[PDB]
Design a protein around this nucleic acid. Structure first.
Length: 136
RNA sequence: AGGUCUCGUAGACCGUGCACCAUGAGCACGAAUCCU
């Protein structure tokens, strides 16, 4: 797992798909094409209590672990690909995206272009729930 | 030739629902104008 390239002149790029719902966050790193992956730790991996799996703490620890693994293998520059749960459920990102991005930037890498790739439907099927909604 | 262009720095709109939560015996109440 070594590479005889230059390090001072330029940097090696990858992309990171940050998928964040209201109950779990994902920090997934692939190559530029996206077929081949590098590392993934989810927000339920760090905390052992499944209540706050979408906490900023678990997203911060997962982003720090992903950045440590990427520095171990040799990825320095990274393109952010932000995604919520999408569909017809909601479009607001979950409560770990900003914390994971700040932890990933503070770890000592380089950030390129931030992109929102949440699936926006053009009038898809019926949303889950009744006509009166979830009354609680 | 001068080597920090000028006048003060709300520069908080981080976010979302929120465990279980029922009932109450009736007797005890009367409606008003003017001075020697």
């Amino acid at each position: 797992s070594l590479g005889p390239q230059v390090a001072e002149g330029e940097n090696v790029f990858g992309v990171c798909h940050i998928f964040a719902s209201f109950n779990d966050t994902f920090v997934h790193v692939t190559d530029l094409s996206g077929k081949e992956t590098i590392c993934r730790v989810t927000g339920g991996m760090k905390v052992k209590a499944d209540r706050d799996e979408s906490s900023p703490y678990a997203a911060m620890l997962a982003a720090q672990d992903v950045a440590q693994r990427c520095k171990e293998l040799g990825i320095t520059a990274l393109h952010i690909k932000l995604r919520a749960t999408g569909g017809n459920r909601t479009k607001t990102p979950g409560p770990g995206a900003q914390s994971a991005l700040r932890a990933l930037a503070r770890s000592g890498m380089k950030i390129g272009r931030i992109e929102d790739v949440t699936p926006i439907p053009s009038d898809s099927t019926r949303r889950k729930g009744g006509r009166r909604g979830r009354r609680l």
